């Protein structure tokens, strides 16, 4: 029973150490944890899923969470997911790197 | 100053970014072409002049006219682009070949013109088979057309072939000029 | 339809698969109106030249009545389900045999 | 909102167009310059290969308008310069009435010698009327059309007929097929024109009197071709019609236009007018009455004067959610506009729920309050014509709830010019103007803080003003109301909605000196609302009386108290009877006067004014009741003071 | 087949209708474009939903 | 179809390599003309491209935004609105008369 | 066996001129509808005009919904069953609203 | 308003003073195409500008394109 996949994954207000991510609600009860990877490394371009490892930034329980860190001309990509106490996670989303 | 000839106005904007500022600008929006059209009218059988050269945009001070007028050759052909409009050097075409299918597909053969004329395109032989023309589309076969023979114009020519069909034009003769612009000028102060 | 103003949420839960099992069930018995039910065998004919053997395999049946027909030419009797002897089933989680992959474990919701 | 698809966006010029606030076109042009392409092997300097960028950057900022103008009149939404507007705005089917003239319909009592049945009055029969600003000066009247009468009983003639302002010209043309027939002059009402070729008719296309269904060819056109001069134009046809499309003229003909002269807006005036009659043996008789129909009447109507840009614009793109027909609510509102429009400020149609068929509209004249009548039957048959079929349009008029402004100005004599009345006028129209902006239409309310600050407008002296105010709302039957009707939308202020004057008539004779008697015709009364009370109650009271005539029985025994139920100042013998309900918190007024049981016919004239004042400071409305004020009709409420200040 | 739609209007077609469309283009040419939706299904649901 | 970029067809109009002796003149009067010819948004683009732009369906076409039925629909997709309200302003005639 | 005879065809490309007056025409046209009295007559005539003859349509009040349409043969009296049927279809693809025909 | 444009914009080179390579050639080259560029797109515009409109806007494919769209497609 997979719960809802989250829509309109938007990113707002980035900065070099502050990114925000946003997204439509999806849903009253539901949770929703994120993921946040390096794609470049040391000036390189690198091919999925042999690289991104990926970083779990926690979940909330509303939408758009407020994120730090991120060196500056690094990171990008975040990915975010739904799920709930009774439904099988939902599947990955990414952002307009 | 055949142009021209009235006044600035003033060129609101306002419909974009509310208390934009007036600029004064030359009066380009009086419908123009159709004052030229109707006072035309009576001086016809303007003749052909065929061109016959790669004048630059403007052989208007070497042909009738010439105070450099720029025009009266324009409103003859009603064209709208002033820059493609008139036949252009040979290599221009060519040049403007490129620009246009560099995109995609490279150079090609846009028709394969049949003798009297009858284009094709996208019809494609198949040599070392039968002699008979395809689409370019249906590679079963089974559907031919033009069982017949003819020769393809690739792209270069084409758009040779379709410049060089651009230059005939109308003169006014370099006589009536004078007394037709002359004309030209009543209609305008006419409405007012 | 797709992406309509108003959205809605429906789970039809799990017991409706298992209350829609309980009517098929539930008249199987004897009469007019209890539609009892048959298993059957099978096909006399070599089915191909490479037949016995552990690769390829029977080819896959068609719903259409050409292939319901060809099971009543090549089909030979028909054994009897009685009520009793169909059965509701459950994976049976055991605890302590050495023999299936985890030994006790049995996370959450589980039976043993 | 809440899903961020739901964005998208209102109408949107790309940031392809926009255009150059110079300096950052300085900036694009140097990246593109110097950068990507060259990495400068310029010969000119150091500092000219510099400089030389921005002398072909003013090249582009110039033809980055010049040029790129052409887009943005070329749209209709994002134009600007109304000669784009208008021209593209007839293939929307439109046209925006580049002037109108007066109309109304007067009734000639006149005569003739020969006393022949069915007189005639031909077209011109030239008028000539003041529309009076004081007296001086004639502007002229034209009947345009045909009517007749009849000879009854004594000799005499009720040809009534209506008018335009203007006279009329003729010109007639030779049709050389190259020659773009027009006309040049600043006039001529597009509504009233008739252009025979030759023979007859030629009923045209773009505006219908009829729409003769079938009929084929004989249409003409009217267009703009910018400039203010109209386009008349043919169709395609051959007539050989061929198959479709204009008759069109044979290669020469003559072409015989007329219109309407319309001197302009300035003939709003009316009222008096003069036969200036020589045709045959009709006397022309006068008593010209004017205004025959109905009540109150501001004279006559229209006048026009070119539309303003912002109005065409949304006229225009709305005749595309239409074509040429009205099955919508919207398109009532946009068939009753420049179309029949000038003659109408604001509209809003509606259909009632309970009544079927019977599309109401709602309209209120320039002129002010009521339509009267044949200014509104002739609304009624432009629709029909193009109306869904079996139902029928009908002009309700909206319910009109005025306000009673009594404010005070209270300029500075130091600084003045022409002093008070010239001032006095000038505060009108701020006033006026204020309305005709915000309010005059439906839905919108007003803060008498926005009317103050017009007020404060009118030129430098005035500083400072304030104002009391009071909602006055006029009953048309009285002596009932209607069912759950007579309503402000407003919370009322109880101890309020104060009577108006009324009178009464019997009791018994009471006779006078000099003459022999009289019927008692003093002694009025009028009406109080009282107080609140545990909810909403409240009651009502009908007036003061005497003793006498009323039906007391058990159900009246007439009394509030000498408490709150205020007292009308007169002999008058209190006595106040209980009449109807007037619920507080929603709004609702209710009489009946029938329940003190007294007859109609000892009361006045109805339609008489309650006015009470409102709570808040902001009036509102709803339900298609407008709050417009007009004072040259009704002064009846307005009263300034300009109490001065010496420094 | 699909019914050749150039001038029957619109709306007579409803949704998922086979009815395509054809215009002038600014260049002489003609073009064939069609309308546009899908007849998507969704999952729990079953219905064909135009 | 890329259309012309007016790049070939003016540099002939320069007078060569006359009155000025530095590449940097050919050179720069050649990106010059980009800016005004070669492009999408630019001016002699934007400009010659009008017109050919009044047909929604178009690509960069617009004008459609502004219809009322861009503004009012609540697709939660955007890009069907995009879609759809690009379609049927290209054909209103159809809605408009069977209304 | 047709009169004098050629083999027909259709026209050219159309003149530019007559291309103008055709817009005209649409948007005074009401098209794939009939909203007015008028409109009735125009649709039924223009289409089985070679049957149909004299139509005219009036709307009654305090009966609303119909608008009655009166048709008359160019060869009989009464309209004969599969015909009054068959000029009832043809305006149901049309119509509008309720108000459909009698 | 050829020699004009020019004549204008040869005022602006002297507002530097003294440009250089501007005295002979070199810029008025350079400068003469932004003199035959801005009468051409002063006109094309302006040609340009009427289309849409239908009963102005000559030639063809400009109407049929503001003819099919709120009218019918032409006969081929």
Request: net charge negative; with cysteine.
């Amino acid at each position: 029973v997979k719960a809802p996949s989250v829509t309109s994954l938007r990113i707002s207000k980035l900065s070099a150490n502050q990114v925000q991510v946003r997204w439509d609600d999806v849903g009253a009860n539901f949770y929703y944890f994120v993921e946040i990877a390096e794609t470049k490394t040391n000036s390189g371009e690198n091919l999925p899923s042999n690289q991104y490892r990926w970083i779990n930034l926690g979940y909330t329980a509303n939408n758009s969470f407020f994120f730090d860190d991120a060196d500056p001309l690094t990171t990008y990509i975040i990915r975010v997911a739904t799920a709930a106490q009774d439904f099988e996670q939902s599947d990955w989303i990414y952002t307009e790197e | 100053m055949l142009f021209t000839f009235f006044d600035p106005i003033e060129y609101a904007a306002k419909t974009v970014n509310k208390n934009a500022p007036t600029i004064p600008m030359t009066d380009i929006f009086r419908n123009y072409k159709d004052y030229f059209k109707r006072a035309l009218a009576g001086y016809r059988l303007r003749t052909y002049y065929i061109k016959g050269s790669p004048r630059p945009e403007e052989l208007a001070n070497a042909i009738y006219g010439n105070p450099q007028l720029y025009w009266v050759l324009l409103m003859c052909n009603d064209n709208y682009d002033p820059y493609y409009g008139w036949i252009t050097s040979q290599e221009a075409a060519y040049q403007a070949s490129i620009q246009k299918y560099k995109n995609v597909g490279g150079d090609q053969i846009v028709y394969h013109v049949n003798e009297n004329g009858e284009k094709f395109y996208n019809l494609i032989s198949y040599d070392d088979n039968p002699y008979v023309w395809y689409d370019k589309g249906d590679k079963a076969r089974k559907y031919p057309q033009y069982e017949g023979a003819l020769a393809a114009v690739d792209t270069y020519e084409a758009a040779v072939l379709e410049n060089e069909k651009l230059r005939q034009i109308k003169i006014i003769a370099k006589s009536d000029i004078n007394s037709f612009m002359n004309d030209l000028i009543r209609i305008m102060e006419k409405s007012y | 339809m797709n992406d309509s103003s108003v959205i809605y949420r429906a789970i039809v839960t799990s017991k409706f698969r298992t209350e829609k099992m309980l009517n098929f069930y539930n008249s199987i018995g004897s009469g007019p109106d209890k539609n009892t039910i048959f298993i059957t065998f099978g096909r006399s004919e070599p089915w191909s030249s490479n037949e016995n053997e552990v690769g390829f395999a029977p080819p896959y049946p068609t719903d259409s009545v050409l292939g319901v027909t060809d099971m009543w030419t090549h089909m030979m009797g028909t054994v009897k389900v009685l009520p009793s002897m169909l059965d509701a089933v459950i994976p049976r989680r055991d605890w302590g045999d050495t023999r299936y992959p985890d030994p006790y474990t049995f996370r959450i919701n589980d039976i043993v | 909102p809440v899903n961020y698809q739901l964005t998208r966006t209102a109408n949107a010029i790309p940031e392809i167009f926009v255009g150059g606030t110079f300096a950052e076109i300085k900036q694009n042009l140097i990246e593109w310059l110097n950068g990507q392409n060259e990495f400068l092997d310029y010969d000119f300097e150091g500092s000219r290969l510099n400089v030389l960028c921005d002398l072909l950057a003013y090249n582009t900022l110039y033809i980055q308008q010049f040029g790129n103008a052409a887009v943005y009149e070329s749209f209709m939404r994002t134009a600007n310069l109304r000669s784009s507007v208008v021209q593209a705005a007839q293939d929307n089917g439109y046209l925006p009435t580049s002037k109108s003239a007066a109309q109304t319909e007067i009734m000639l009592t006149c005569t003739d010698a020969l006393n022949r049945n069915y007189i005639t009055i031909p077209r011109g029969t030239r008028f000539l009327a003041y529309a009076k600003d004081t007296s001086v000066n004639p502007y002229n009247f034209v009947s345009r059309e045909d009517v007749i009468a009849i000879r009854d009983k004594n000799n005499q003639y009720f040809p009534r007929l209506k008018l335009a302002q203007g006279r009329i010209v003729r010109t007639e043309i030779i049709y050389d097929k190259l020659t773009p027939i027009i006309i040049y002059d600043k006039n001529i009402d597009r509504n009233q024109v008739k252009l025979y070729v030759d023979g007859a008719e030629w009923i045209n296309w773009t505006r219908k009197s009829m729409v003769h269904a079938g009929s084929t060819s004989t249409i003409y056109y009217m267009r703009e071709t910018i400039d203010g001069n109209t386009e008349f134009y043919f169709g395609e046809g051959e007539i050989s019609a061929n198959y479709i499309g204009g008759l069109k003229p044979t290669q020469n003909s003559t072409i015989v236009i007329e219109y309407i002269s319309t001197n302009g807006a300035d003939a709003n005036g009316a009222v008096g007018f003069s036969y200036a009659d020589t045709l045959t043996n009709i006397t022309v008789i006068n008593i010209n009455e004017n205004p025959n129909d109905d009540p109150d009447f501001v004279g006559a109507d229209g006048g026009g004067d070119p539309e303003d840009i912002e109005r065409i614009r949304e006229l225009g793109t709305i005749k595309r959610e239409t074509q040429q027909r009205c099955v919508t609510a919207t398109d009532y509102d946009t068939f009753v506009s420049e179309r029949f429009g000038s003659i109408i400020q604001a509209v809003q149609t509606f259909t009632d729920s309970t009544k079927p068929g019977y599309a109401f509209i709602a309209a209120k004249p320039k002129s002010g309050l009521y339509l009267t009548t044949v200014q509104r039957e002739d609304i009624k048959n432009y629709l029909k014509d193009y109306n869904l079929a079996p139902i029928t349009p009908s002009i309700i008029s909206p319910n009109y709830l005025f306000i009673k402004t009594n404010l005070k100005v209270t300029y500075a004599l130091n600084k003045l010019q022409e002093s008070e009345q010239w001032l006095e006028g000038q505060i009108i129209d701020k006033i006026d103007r204020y309305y005709t902006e915000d309010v005059e239409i439906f839905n919108s309310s007003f803060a008498k803080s926005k009317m103050l600050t017009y007020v404060d407008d009118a030129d430098h002296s005035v500083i400072g003003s304030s104002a009391t105010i009071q909602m006055v709302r006029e009953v048309q039957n009285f002596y009932k109301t209607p069912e759950a009707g007579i309503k402000y939308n407003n919370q009322i202020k109880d101890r309020s909605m104060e009577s108006n004057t009324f009178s009464f008539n019997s009791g018994r004779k009471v006779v006078n000196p000099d003459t022999g008697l009289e019927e008692d015709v003093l002694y009025d009364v009028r009406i109080v609302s009282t107080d609140r009370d545990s909810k909403g109650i409240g009651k009502v009271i009908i007036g003061p009386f005497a003793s006498g005539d009323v039906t007391e029985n058990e159900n009246i025994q007439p009394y509030t108290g000498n408490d709150f139920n205020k007292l009308a100042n007169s002999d008058g013998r209190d006595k106040y009877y209980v009449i109807g309900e007037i619920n507080y918190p929603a709004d609702v007024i209710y009489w009946n006067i029938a329940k003190i049981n007294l007859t109609s016919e000892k009361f006045e004239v109805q339609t008489i004014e309650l006015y009470s004042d409102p709570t808040d400071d902001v009036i509102f409305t709803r339900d298609g009741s407008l709050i417009v004020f007009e004072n040259d009709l009704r002064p009846q409420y307005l009263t300034i003071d300009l109490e001065p200040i010496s420094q | 087949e699909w019914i050749n739609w150039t001038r029957k209007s619109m709306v007579h077609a409803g949704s998922t209708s086979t009815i395509y469309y054809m215009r002038e283009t600014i260049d002489g040419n003609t073009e064939f474009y069609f309308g546009e939706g899908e007849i998507s299904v969704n999952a729990s649901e079953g219905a064909l939903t135009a | 179809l890329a259309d012309p970029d007016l790049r070939p067809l003016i540099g002939t109009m320069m007078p060569d390599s006359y009155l000025l002796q530095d590449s940097n003149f050919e050179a720069f009067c050649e990106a010059y003309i980009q800016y005004l010819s070669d492009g999408y948004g630019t001016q002699y683009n934007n400009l010659r491209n009008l017109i050919r732009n009044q047909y929604p369906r178009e690509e960069h076409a617009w004008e459609y935004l502004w219809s009322e039925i861009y503004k009012r629909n609540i697709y939660l997709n955007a890009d069907k609105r995009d879609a759809v309200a690009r379609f049927f302003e290209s054909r209103s005639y159809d809605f408009y008369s069977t209304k």
